[PDB]
Amino acid sequence: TLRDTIPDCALRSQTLESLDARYVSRDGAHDAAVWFEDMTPAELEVVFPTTDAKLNYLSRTQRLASLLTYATPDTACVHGELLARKRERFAAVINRFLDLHQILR
Amino acid sequence: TMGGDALRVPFLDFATATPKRHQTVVPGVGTLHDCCEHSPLFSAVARRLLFNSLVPAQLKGRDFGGDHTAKLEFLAPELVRAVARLRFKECAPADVVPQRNAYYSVLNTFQALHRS
Amino acid sequence: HGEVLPATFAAVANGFAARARFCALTAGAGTVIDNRSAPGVFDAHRFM
Amino acid sequence: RAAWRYIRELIIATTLFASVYRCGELELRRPDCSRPTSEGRYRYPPGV
Ligand SMILES: [Zn+2]
Numbered sequence: 004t005l006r007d008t009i010p011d012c013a014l015r016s017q018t019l020e021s022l023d024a025r026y027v028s029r030d031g032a033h034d035a036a037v038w039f040e041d042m043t044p045a046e047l048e049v050v051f052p053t054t055d056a057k058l059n060y061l062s063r064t065q066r067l068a069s070l071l072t073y074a075t076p077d078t079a080c081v082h083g084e085l086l087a088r089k090r091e092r093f094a095a096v097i098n099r100f101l102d103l104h105q106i107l108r
Numbered sequence: 109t110m111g112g113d114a115l116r117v118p119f120l121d122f123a124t125a126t127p128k129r130h131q132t133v134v135p136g137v138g139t140l141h142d143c144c145e146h147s148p149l150f151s152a153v154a155r156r157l158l159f160n161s162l163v164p165a166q167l168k169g170r171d172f173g174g175d176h177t178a179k180l181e182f183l184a185p186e187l188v189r190a191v192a193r194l195r196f197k198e199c200a201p202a203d204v205v206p207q208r209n210a211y212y213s214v215l216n217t218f219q220a221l222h223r224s
Numbered sequence: 225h226g227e228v229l230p231a232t233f234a235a236v237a238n239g240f241a242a243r244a245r246f247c248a249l250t251a252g253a254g255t256v257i258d259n260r261s262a263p264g265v266f267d268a269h270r271f272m
Numbered sequence: 273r274a275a276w277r278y279i280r281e282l283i284i285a286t287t288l289f290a291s292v293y294r295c296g297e298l299e300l301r302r303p304d305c306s307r308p309t310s311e312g313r314y315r316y317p318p319g320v
Contacts, residue, residue, distance in 0.1 A: 007197060054141075217292060242307075245314070
């Protein structure tokens with residue numbers, strides 16, 4: 004009793020809105036289940052087999068994407084300037100963090 | 109003497125599609141994916157609603173709601189009547205046998221601090 | 225002669241005797257849950 | 273050194289398990305103890 008949506012649909016040649024109107028938006032829809040399918044692909048678990056490893060990659064690619072979009076002619080975005088300032092300050096901070104410990108010796 | 113109602117809740121064995129190699133156990137709730145521990149937006153709400161039971165009523169404040177700390181644990185009556193008719197799946201038997209043990213054991217270290 | 229050798233010999237041998245005795249006394253017990261074979265133990269190892 | 277490492281891992285894992293899952297007690301024991309009584313009885317108590 005109280006079946007899920009995956010035993011309900013059984014057909015996947017359609018658009019999302021049709022299925023919405025046919026299974027979840029009908030007045031007679033019993034809607035008596037909540038079960039989120041596992042969407043991670045095995046072709047990705049076999050290489051990143053750890054939530055920490057799946058999060059480090061998910062953050063590295065996020066940083067890459069945020070670098071690529073900010074690097075017709077508007078160019079007047081505060082986020083590009085913020086990323087530039089952050090990169091410059093990070094470079095200048097690591098600069099005075101290796102030399103400072105070179106001096107202390 | 110027994111504290112609040114947040115440290116006595118039943119199982120609520122909803123479901124999970126994640127392998128046991130990943131799932132973690134947040135106290136007070138069931139067993140969820142591991143990604144729910146690196147997200148403070150959840151691991152700071154599911155943990156504050158627990159310790160909001162150990163806190164006595166003389167320490168919630170001065171105008172905090174009669175029965176509970178409304179600023180943390182309050183659901184409108186419409187939302188309570190709406191989530192009442194929400195029903196999760198049911199855990200598989202071979203999976204509910206150890207899930208209930210993990211749940212009621214990760215909670216014992218709280219019903220044990222409330223006594224010491 | 226001194227009473228050292230036949231005392232330290234016993235004191236040393238008793239440890240290994242007890243270890244080999246505990247290794248074989250538990251094999252004959254009630255329900256054994258030997259987990260040296262791992263068909264489905266990786267999940268419960270990584271979770272814990 | 274590789275044995276000291278495994279012993280340290282076992283001890284710290286047992287401590288953290290006693291701290292997290294308060295249900296268990298986990299008396300970390302050794303089989304070399306428990307010398308025998310009057311005759312053929314060893315009475316190994318619970319533990320790991
Ligand atoms: Zn912008």
